[PDB]
Design a binder for these strands. Structure first.
Lengths: 226, 208, 82, 65, 126, 129
RNA sequence: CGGGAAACCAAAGUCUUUGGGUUCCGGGGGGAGUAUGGUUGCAAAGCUGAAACUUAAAGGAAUUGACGGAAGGGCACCACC
């Protein structure tokens, strides 16, 4: 392809390390729990070859002095196929912007997924380590590990998110007003993200850990400006 | 002791401290601060543990060294009593500054003109400087702080108990920190005394 | 996180709080650790060589990070009679 | 080792292998779990009569058969 | 009142003053000439309105520092003023007068010191 | 009043670990509480515990690490039939792989893995992971 | 902390990670606390309590205007003075 790459320039030290080829995977950020404020960071480290699917469009509105207003809300999900996903909702004047912003929002939110084995761990993880549930304003989604070939047993919208996350097989049960899509996807998003939070016995032991690329790269991440 | 000797108490300092009336402590304890407390004076007031106030201050100092780029430790005060105080600390040690109206969106929010990515915040009143203490907790930055007996412990790791009701107590403690950090990973050498008069830290104010 | 032939799979092993032994997970940016300098004994002379602790969002929001540091710093020095 | 699991597992496998549907490492249960439809579909006449020239079409194959 | 200077004007005044203080003056007539030299302003009425408000500022600045304006010279002046320090004030004069317990504060702190006792009475809340 | 004593001990624990606590004082304790605390201990989910002897019913101090997501109690103590154990662990355990259902059998208070190996069964006490 | 749709709630917390004891009532809205039998009552009435039919929303909460013979507000001789 040839369209003339932009000229991203970074606000953030985390960003400088990334462009410099100093940070190479999101994992570094995730382990450090560095916050990510520049969307390009996500874009350079992953996202390249990460596909975004727009989930919904539904319009809303609120009342003006001289009567009405109405605008477009877009729900976007992003993820490779393996282990990374994000979710973003935006409402804007125009569909394109709503989608364009939503994608940006989704990327900022990208989250780790811990994918595991239903039980006999051969040939790499097909499902989830444990069972994790997430709730958003009365919708709650529960993910359950399942045997191979089970696949994603969820509603179409949820299947799509789980798919991008890179889950092969998982059982789901959903309670609450499933109809209100923004809520259902949000809860499922919380559910998947919760997998990293689960502490299993595998995790029980600790570690010099890390010094943080921010510290080692520190000079590197104070360029020659101010 | 610990790191091994000289580093212990020094009457000379316990003298400056008592003089500056640090240990005097707030009538309202607060629960998370109970450890600092030495004893309660009659006629209500609490005596802070200067020994404890001391050691933590040193522990603070050490955390300020170990940051490599000294500029990116932010010393902070909106309180008047601590304004010249922090300005001085920033002059000596690298340490960039944030006095007065902290300005919200300084840690979160790239776009802004006071955008800072410190690796360490030192705050003087956790109640007055609550904004900086909150913003810092939106972005993984450790916090040293000025705490009297009744200060918010939320989102502050490391306290140095003071008096912060005021006077020279806020002056001395910022002074001693800069004095301590220059000693460590600096170049004072000889955790011997000051060519700088501690008054240089201390609040200014008005005029007739 | 082994796989079939003792291989290490998924993608990372998170750091664990220094106070609660609970996963820092991964987007909770209301949490940070704290590198304490080692001293070349004797005194001063910051010499590296960090002594380091990581504290969870939880502990910090509950108005600990500080003490936790002290149990942490004294138990392994410096800090005595705290 | 559970007489029920042993006696019927081995049988399911042996049945699945006679038809070529399944292969040995598979040829344990842990592998059938990780299997699919093509694997059966591949064994019908129709596609074989193609698969060795004697049809040149999955087409031709079915009308031949 | 009816003449309240708008930002486009007020901004320019803060602006010039920040980069022009030692050049500018007390008098409308001259800054007005100066705005021609140091700025490109499209209509004459605007340039006048600017010169005029910035002069009202200079008149004020030259009588007391004004809420949001900084110039190199004013920084230097504050700097010099912000030195003062006498015979010095504490002393505190021979002997500190303590409130005791604060006496017991030193007594049980292993610390010599000067002395005086006057610390009794409780002690109502509110 | 009190029907069971286990349920209190377990809950007390769970809230300790949820707070970020590293110790608890449970009251009042029992042979069954000890036995359950013990199965937990063998597996790592708690540190060491200590039965203090008031001249009454006991008080226990448990020192806990933080490997514990949850330790629950099942009431009532349903009877389980060897192929209802398979059904229980699935109902209430995170992955097939880990976490234990702990029940009481004629041959001792045990985690269900030990149950499967002995080849005995009984009535369900509780769980953890 | 945590709960809840929120308003809120240290209990309305410890609820999908759903299991401390026990008791009661509800399953769209109207028909209806109505008909009918029983019961209690001097009486007035009370308790128990349907259906046929009717209908796609009834309802809750928060958000925002519009609007007020609600409160403080202003502004204009298209308002008064």
């Amino acid at each position: 392809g040839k369209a003339g790459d932009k000229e991203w320039l970074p606000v953030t030290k985390l960003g400088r390390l990334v462009k410099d080829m100093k940070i190479k995977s999101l994992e570094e950020i995730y382990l450090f729990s560095l916050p990510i404020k520049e969307s390009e960071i996500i874009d350079f480290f992953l996202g390249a070859a990460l596909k975004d699917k727009v989930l919904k469009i539904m319009p809303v509105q609120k009342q003006t002095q001289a009567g009405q207003r109405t605008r477009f809300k877009a729900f976007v999900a992003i993820g490779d196929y393996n282990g990374h996903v994000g979710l973003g909702m935006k409402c804007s004047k125009e569909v394109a912007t709503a989608i364009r912003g939503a994608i940006i929002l989704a990327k900022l939110s990208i989250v780790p997924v811990r994918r595991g084995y239903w039980g006999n761990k051969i040939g790499k993880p097909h499902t989830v380590r444990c069972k994790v549930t997430g709730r958003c304003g009365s919708v709650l989604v529960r993910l359950i590990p399942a045997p191979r070939g089970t696949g994603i047993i969820s509603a179409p919208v949820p299947k799509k998110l789980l798919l991008m996350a890179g889950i092969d097989d998982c059982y789901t049960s959903a309670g609450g007003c499933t109809a209100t899509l923004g809520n259902f996807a949000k809860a499922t998003f919380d559910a998947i993200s919760k997998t990293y939070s689960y502490l299993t016995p595998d995790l029980w032991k600790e570690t010099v850990f890390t010094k943080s690329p921010y510290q080692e790269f520190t000079d590197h991440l104070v360029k020659t400006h101010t | 002791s610990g790191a091994l000797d000289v580093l212990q108490m020094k009457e000379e300092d316990v003298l400056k401290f008592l003089a500056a009336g640090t240990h005097l402590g707030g009538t309202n304890l607060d629960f998370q601060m109970e450890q600092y407390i030495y004893k309660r004076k009659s006629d209500g007031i609490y005596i802070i543990n200067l020994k404890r106030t001391w050691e933590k201050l040193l522990l603070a100092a050490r955390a300020i060294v170990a940051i490599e780029n000294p500029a990116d430790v932010s010393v902070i005060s909106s309180r008047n009593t601590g304004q010249r105080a922090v300005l001085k600390f920033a002059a000596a040690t690298g340490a960039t500054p944030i006095a007065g109206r902290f300005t919200p969106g300084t840690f979160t929010n790239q776009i802004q003109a006071a955008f800072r990515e410190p690796r360490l915040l030192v705050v003087t009143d956790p109640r007055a400087d609550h904004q900086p203490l909150t913003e810092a907790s939106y972005v993984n930055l450790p916090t040293i702080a000025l705490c009297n007996t009744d200060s918010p412990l939320r989102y502050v790791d490391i306290a140095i108990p003071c008096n912060n009701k005021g006077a020279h107590s806020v002056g001395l403690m910022w002074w001693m920190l800069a004095r301590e950090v220059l000693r460590m990973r600096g170049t004072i050498s000889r955790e011997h005394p000051w060519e700088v008069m501690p008054d240089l830290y201390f609040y200014r104010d008005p005029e007739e | 996180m082994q796989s079939n032939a003792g291989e290490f799979v998924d993608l990372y092993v998170p750091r664990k709080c220094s106070a609660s032994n609970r996963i820092i997970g991964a987007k909770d940016h209301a949490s940070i650790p704290m590198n304490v300098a080692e001293v070349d004994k004797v005194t001063g002379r910051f010499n590296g060589q960090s002594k380091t602790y990581a504290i969870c969002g939880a502990i910090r929001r509950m108005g600990e990070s500080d003490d936790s540091i002290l149990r942490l710093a004294k138990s392994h020095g410096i800090v005595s009679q705290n | 080792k559970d007489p029920r699991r042993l006696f019927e597992g081995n049988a399911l496998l042996r049945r699945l292998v006679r038809i070529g549907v399944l292969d040995e490492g598979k040829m344990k249960l842990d592998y059938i779990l990780g299997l699919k439809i093509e694997d059966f579909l591949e064994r019908r006449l129709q596609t074989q009569v193609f698969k060795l020239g004697l049809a040149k079409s999955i087409h031709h194959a079915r009308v031949l058969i | 009142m009816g003449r309240v200077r708008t930002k486009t004007v007020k901004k320019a005044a803060r602006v010039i003053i920040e980069k022009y203080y030692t050049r500018l003056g007390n008098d409308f007539h001259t800054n007005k000439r100066v705005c021609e030299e140091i700025a490109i302003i499209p209509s004459k009425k605007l340039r006048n309105k600017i010169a005029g408000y910035v002069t009202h500022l200079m008149k004020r600045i030259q009588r007391g520092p004004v809420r949001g304006i900084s110039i190199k010279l004013q920084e230097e002046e504050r700097e010099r003023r912000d030195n003062y320090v006498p015979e010095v004030s504490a002393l505190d004069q021979e002997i500190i007068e303590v409130d005791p317990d604060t006496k017991e504060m030193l007594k049980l702190l292993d610390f010599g010191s000067l002395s005086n006792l006057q610390v009794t009475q409780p002690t109502v809340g509110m | 009043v009190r029907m069971n004593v286990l349920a209190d001990a377990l809950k007390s624990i769970n809230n300790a670990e949820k707070r970020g606590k590293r110790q608890v004082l449970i009251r009042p304790c029992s042979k069954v509480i000890v036995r359950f605390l013990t199965v937990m201990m063998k597996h790592g989910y708690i540190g060491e515990f200590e039965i203090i002897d008031d001249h009454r019913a006991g008080k226990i101090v448990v020192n806990l690490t933080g490997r514990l997501n949850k330790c629950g109690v099942i009431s009532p103590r349903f009877d389980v039939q060897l192929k209802d154990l398979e059904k229980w662990q699935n109902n209430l355990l995170p992955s097939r792989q880990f976490g234990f259902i702990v029940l009481t059998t004629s041959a001792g208070i045990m985690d269900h893995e030990e149950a499967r190996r002995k080849h005995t069964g009984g009535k369900i006490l509780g769980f953890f992971f």
